[PDB]
C-alpha cells in the first residue's frame, strides 16, 4: 500500500503531462520583456543567461539557441523534444519552464533561475561528497527517473554539470536536449562519454535502463570525486566501459559497492532499475535504508549543504563566461523547421 499511492500519484501525473504533451504551450513571452544580465553557461548552439522579467522583477534563466546552428548540426528533432518535454513535465526536482518563444534568429526558453550553481562546481571544489551527502542527491534522482520513465521519457544526459542546486540545497535537473518520449527502443549515439551505458557504445539499441547505468556513474563520481571510467580520449573511455571492470575506493562502504555493482551491470537482465520490481529494487536497497522517500519528495529532509546566496540575481556560485550581444536578423531563418516551437 506504500507502492500503491505512488502508483496513484503517478497516474494523475501522467494525465497532467499528456494534456500538455498533446497541446504544447507556445509564444508566451517576447525577448524585450527581459533584461539580460549574465551568462550562466554555454553550449554548441547558444547559452543560458540570468535575466530579469521586467513586469514582475522576477529572475529567470533563459536558454537561447541559434536556429541556423541547430540545423547545421542536425539537432532539430532533439531541440523540439527538449522544449516539448520541458513545458509538459512537473516534478520538484525538474527545473520549471515559465515561458518559451522564438524570433527570426533564435529559440528561447525561460526557466526558473537556480542560484546554487551546478553540482559539478561544488563536487570539484570539495573533492568528493561523503556517502550521506551523495545519498541525499541520489535519492532525488531516483524519484525523478521514476517520474520520467512512467511518462515514457528517457533523460539520457545525467551528470553533475546538469544538476543545479537550489536555495534549499535540493536538485533541479536541467538540459533536456537528449530527452525523448519513447515506448520500446531507440538508437541515437548520444550522451556524455563517461556516463554512456555499454549498450549505447555497442549500437545495440537501448531503453530507459541506460538512465540507471548513468545513475551508477553519478553516485560513484559523487562518492569518489572522479568517475569509474575516465581517460584522456573518448575511445579509451568506451573500451573501459564495455569491459565493465569497476574498481572502488577503499573508503566506499560495502553497501555502496553492492549498489554500484548492480547499477553498473552490463547484463540488462541483472541491472537494477530494469527488473520485475523496477525502481523498488533501488529504493529498498540497503545503501538507501536511512532514506525516507516521501520526506525527500516533500523537501522535508534537511540538506547537508545550503549554498551562500547574497541577494537575488547573484551569480557567485557560477563561473564567468565570455559575453556576446544577441543579434536578431531582419529575415526569418529556418521557419518551417521550428514551427512547432
Amino acid at each position: 500500500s506504500e507502492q500503491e499511492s505512488v502508483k496513484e500519484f503517478l497516474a494523475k501525473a501522467k494525465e497532467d503531462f499528456l494534456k500538455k504533451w498533446e497541446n504544447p504551450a507556445q509564444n508566451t513571452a517576447h525577448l524585450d520583456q527581459f533584461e539580460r544580465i549574465k551568462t550562466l553557461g554555454t553550449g554548441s548552439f547558444g547559452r543560458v543567461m540570468l535575466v530579469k522579467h521586467m513586469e514582475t522583477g522576477n529572475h529567470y534563466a533563459m536558454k537561447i539557441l541559434d536556429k541556423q546552428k541547430v540545423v547545421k548540426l542536425k539537432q532539430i528533432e532533439h531541440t523540439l523534444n527538449e522544449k516539448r518535454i520541458l513545458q509538459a513535465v512537473n516534478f520538484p526536482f525538474l527545473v520549471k519552464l515559465e515561458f518559451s518563444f522564438k524570433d527570426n534568429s533564435n529559440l528561447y526558453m525561460v526557466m526558473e533561475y537556480v542560484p546554487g550553481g551546478e553540482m559539478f562546481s561544488h563536487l570539484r571544489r570539495i573533492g568528493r561528497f561523503s556517502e550521506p551527502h551523495a545519498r541525499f542527491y541520489a535519492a532525488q534522482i531516483v524519484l525523478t527517473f521514476e517520474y520520467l520513465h512512467s511518462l515514457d521519457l528517457i533523460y539520457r544526459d545525467l551528470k553533475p554539470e546538469n544538476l543545479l542546486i537550489d536555495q534549499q540545497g535540493y536538485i533541479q535537473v536541467t538540459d533536456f536536449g537528449f530527452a525523448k518520449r519513447v515506448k520500446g527502443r531507440t538508437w541515437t549515439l548520444c550522451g556524455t562519454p563517461e556516463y554512456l551505458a555499454p549498450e549505447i557504445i555497442l549500437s545495440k539499441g537501448y531503453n530507459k535502463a541506460v538512465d540507471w547505468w548513468a545513475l551508477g556513474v553519478l553516485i560513484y563520481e559523487m562518492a569518489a570525486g572522479y568517475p569509474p571510467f575516465f581517460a584522456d580520449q573518448p575511445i579509451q573511455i568506451y573500451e573501459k566501459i564495455v569491459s565493465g571492470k569497476v574498481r572502488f575506493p577503499s573508503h566506499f562502504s560495502s553497501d555502496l559497492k553492492d549498489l554500484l555493482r548492480n547499477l553498473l551491470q552490463v547484463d540488462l537482465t541483472k541491472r537494477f532499475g530494469n527488473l520485475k520490481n523496477g525502481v523498488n529494487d533501488i529504493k529498498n536497497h540497503k545503501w538507501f535504508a536511512t532514506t525516507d522517500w516521501i520526506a525527500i519528495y516533500q523537501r522535508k529532509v534537511e540538506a547537508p549543504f545550503i549554498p551562500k546566496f547574497k541577494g537575488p540575481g547573484d551569480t557567485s556560485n557560477f563561473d564567468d563566461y565570455e559575453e556576446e550581444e544577441i543579434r536578431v536578423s531582419i529575415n526569418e531563418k529556418c521557419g518551417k523547421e521550428f514551427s512547432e516551437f
Binding site: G43, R124, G127, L189, C190, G191, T192, Y226, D232, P249
Partner: peptide
C-alpha cells in the same frame, strides 16, 4: 593514486555530449 591521475587528465572540466 587514481585521484591524482584524474586531476592530471583533460576530463576534469565540463564535459560536452557527443553526436555521430
Amino acid at each position: 593514486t587514481t585521484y591524482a591521475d584524474f586531476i592530471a587528465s583533460g576530463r576534469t572540466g565540463r564535459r560536452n555530449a557527443i553526436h555521430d
